[PDB]
């Protein structure tokens, strides 16, 4: 099915007037493959996956030069935004940037992204047409006008529709064993007596990849959201993911309830029932 390449950049000015933190992470789908972290005293773009580590010194020198260029960009951006918003240097502020591309099962371009937040809220985003900007507030209007006058969108489209897709395809071919895998969830149900009057049924999904999954409860084959709880999907630490969903049910009624698991790695959706 689909694949994506994404870069996530975080830039944090510190209380007072010293050096900001800069971190850059790259993903293909839910697999981290590169990092650069000023709080780790990084000097180089560093590999996080076997299939990227096999690239030669040319690749690694090139990625190192470019990540240092991105760092210097965000250094300027922190100063620019203090100016746009009339903020002192005493405060700590955050710039985030995300860009990348999605490809379909045919490995053709579907979508590109290039978007920013400032202090936890949208700042500016490239629209899906890759020609126009959404500016969240009056200050992001300044960036929009500058980027329209400077024709920035046309240079980003060339990368997002061309280079980005071409390198994702190389990564998918080189990493095929890792990136083109699906690990189906290992599923089970638990039962915890809350009182004599209620039980918790907890439906588990473990060691799945990719992260995308749906756990849903039914009662007598009808959708059930009342008295349910569902945790954020979480990383196991070995490149797979976990999730659970739970429902609190009256004593004696356990058999009414079914858990439904959907995941790209399953040949068909699963149905789980509590088995005395």
């Amino acid at each position: 099915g689909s694949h994506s390449m994404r870069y996530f950049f975080t830039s944090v000015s510190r209380p007072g007037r010293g050096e900001p933190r800069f971190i850059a992470v790259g993903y293909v789908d839910d697999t981290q493959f590169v990092r650069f972290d000023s709080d780790a005293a990084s000097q180089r773009m560093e590999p996080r996956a076997p299939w990227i580590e096999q690239e030669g010194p040319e690749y690694w020198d090139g990625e190192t030069r470019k990540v240092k260029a991105h760092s210097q960009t965000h250094r300027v951006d922190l100063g620019t935004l203090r100016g746009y918003y009339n903020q002192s240097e005493a405060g700590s502020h955050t710039v985030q940037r995300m860009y990348g591309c999605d490809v379909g099962s045919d490995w053709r371009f579907l979508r590109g992204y290039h978007q920013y937040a400032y202090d936890g809220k949208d700042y500016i985003a490239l629209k899906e047409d890759l020609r126009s900007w959404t500016a969240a507030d009056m200050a992001a209007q300044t960036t929009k006008h500058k980027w329209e006058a400077a024709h920035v969108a046309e240079q980003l489209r060339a990368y997002l529709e061309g280079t980005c897709v071409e390198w994702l395809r190389r990564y998918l071919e080189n990493g095929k064993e890792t990136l083109q895998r699906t690990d189906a969830p290992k599923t089970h149900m638990t039962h915890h007596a809350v009182s004599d009057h209620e039980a918790t049924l907890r439906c588990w999904a473990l060691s799945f990849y990719p992260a995308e999954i749906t756990l849903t409860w039914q009662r007598d084959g009808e959708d059930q959201t009342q008295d349910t709880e569902l945790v954020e999907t979480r990383p196991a630490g070995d490149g797979t993911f976990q999730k659970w969903a739970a429902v609190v049910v009256p004593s004696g009624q356990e058999q009414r309830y079914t858990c439904h698991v959907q995941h790209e790695g399953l040949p068909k959706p699963l149905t789980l029932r509590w088995e005395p």
Binding site: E63, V67, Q72, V76, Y159
Partner: peptide
């Protein structure tokens, strides 16, 4: 593979 160009807010 990172973008080659630099654009400033």
């Amino acid at each position: 593979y990172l973008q080659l160009r630099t654009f400033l807010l």
